[PDB]
Amino acid sequence: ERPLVFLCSGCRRPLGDSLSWVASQEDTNCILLRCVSCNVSVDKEQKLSKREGCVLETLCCAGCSLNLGYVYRCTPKNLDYKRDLFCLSVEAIESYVLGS
Amino acid sequence: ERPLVFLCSGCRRPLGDSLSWVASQEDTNCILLRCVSCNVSVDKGCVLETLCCAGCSLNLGYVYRCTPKNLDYKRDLFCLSVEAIESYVLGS
Ligand SMILES: [Zn+2]
Ligand SMILES: [Zn+2]
Numbered sequence: 612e613r614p615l616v617f618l619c620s621g622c623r624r625p626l627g628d629s630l631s632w633v634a635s636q637e638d639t640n641c642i643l644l645r646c647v648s649c650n651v652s653v654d655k656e657q658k659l660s661k662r663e664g665c666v667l668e669t670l671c672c673a674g675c676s677l678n679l680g681y682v683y684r685c686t687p688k689n690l691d692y693k694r695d696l697f698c699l700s701v702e703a704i705e706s707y708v709l710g711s
Numbered sequence: 712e713r714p715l716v717f718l719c720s721g722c723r724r725p726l727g728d729s730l731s732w733v734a735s736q737e738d739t740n741c742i743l744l745r746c747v748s749c750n751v752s753v754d755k756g757c758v759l760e761t762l763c764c765a766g767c768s769l770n771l772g773y774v775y776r777c778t779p780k781n782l783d784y785k786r787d788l789f790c791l792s793v794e795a796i797e798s799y800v801l802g803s
Binding site: 648 | 722801802
């Protein structure tokens with residue numbers, strides 16, 4: 612195929628690429644990355660989950676402090692696969708596609 | 712192996728990527744790209760118009776338009792100054 616780079620919406624810093632893109636979520640409109648760049652920082656405050664409850668710290672761009680998503684830190688057995696993966700909101704990243 | 716994405720030193724807009732890279736050893740301060748993104752705006756002894764960034768105006772490089780035989784490779788390629796771009800490598 613052709614790989615992607617994900618850029619912060621608020622300032623265009625590189626957040627990650629499709630090489631670490633493991634999975635997606637249709638309802639939360641997030642993509643799940645195994646691996647992120649130095650520009651995704653982790654607000655060290657554990658907040659509870661408000662959906663179908665996990666513990667998860669929120670992600671934001673080291674550059675402009677835009678809210679980028681969340682990481683699952685603590686999860687029940689059924690959600691262990693999402694644990695430690697970076698969920699990036701689609702409404703907060705912009706894709707650049709390689710190949711012109 | 713893994714590809715690169717080149718980006719404007721000034722506003723981080725994407726310029727182009729290593730998929731278009733032209734391996735040259737003649738020039739020592741420019742990356743040669745066979746094609747570039749919408750963000751590389753071309754504006755206004757070789758004739759060569761100047762490249763700059765469509766978002767922020769930063770002088771980015773140049774394009775050799777008229778060349779002699781020995782420079783025919785550089786012709787119509789976008790030379791991005793490595794002092795005016797940055798790169799993100801995929802897999803990081
Ligand atoms: Zn940002
Ligand atoms: Zn720029």
